Design a protein around this ligand. Structure first.
Ligand SMILES: [Ca+2]
Ligand SMILES: [Ca+2]
Ligand SMILES: [Ca+2]
Ligand SMILES: [Zn+2]
Ligand SMILES: [Zn+2]
Length: 158
């Protein structure tokens, strides 16, 4: 599928979930990007104005793309593959309760997965992979991509 054809990728946090401290949203997203820049040539930078490649949005229900959220549970987030406009963008369902920890839905872990999509990955069938469809909390402080994820992203970049 589509991939970014440049190494410097920008993201912008469109709006912040009230579920978390602002700085914790910033950090979770930053760290999630780092997971992927760790294993590719990509460089991610947060911008605070203008058009980013990857717009990070918190929204609930119907939110202006064709892909409505479903309230608490079920779909946690979704993201568009590389492309102009909505391409790359990552949307997080505000009806989830986002956290820094194992309570609610961990934003960092979810963002790692979604950013995978923003970079052009699809889902893995391996339950060990962050790109497995199903959210499962794993210790975020010890988090590592599965070999499956690394193989996936290194099939696209590098
Ligand atoms: Ca975009
Ligand atoms: Ca949901
Ligand atoms: Ca929420
Ligand atoms: Zn959306
Ligand atoms: Zn997914």
């Amino acid at each position: 599928g589509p991939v970014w054809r440049k190494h410097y990728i920008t993201y912008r946090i469109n709006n912040y979930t009230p579920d978390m401290n602002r700085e914790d949203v910033d950090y979770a997203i930053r760290k999630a990007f780092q997971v992927w820049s760790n294993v590719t040539p990509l460089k991610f930078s947060k911008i605070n104005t203008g058009m980013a490649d990857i717009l990070v949005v918190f929204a609930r229900g119907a939110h202006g793309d064709d892909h409505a959220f479903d309230g608490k549970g079920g779909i946690l987030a979704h993201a568009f593959g590389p492309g102009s406009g909505i391409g790359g963008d990552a949307h997080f369902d505000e009806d989830e309760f986002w956290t820094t920890h194992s309570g609610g839905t961990n934003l960092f872990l979810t963002a790692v997965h979604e950013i995978g999509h923003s970079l052009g990955l699809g889902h893995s069938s391996d339950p060990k992979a962050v790109m497995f469809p199903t959210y499962k909390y794993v210790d975020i402080n010890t988090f590592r991509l599965s070999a499956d994820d690394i193989r996936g992203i290194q099939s696209l970049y590098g």
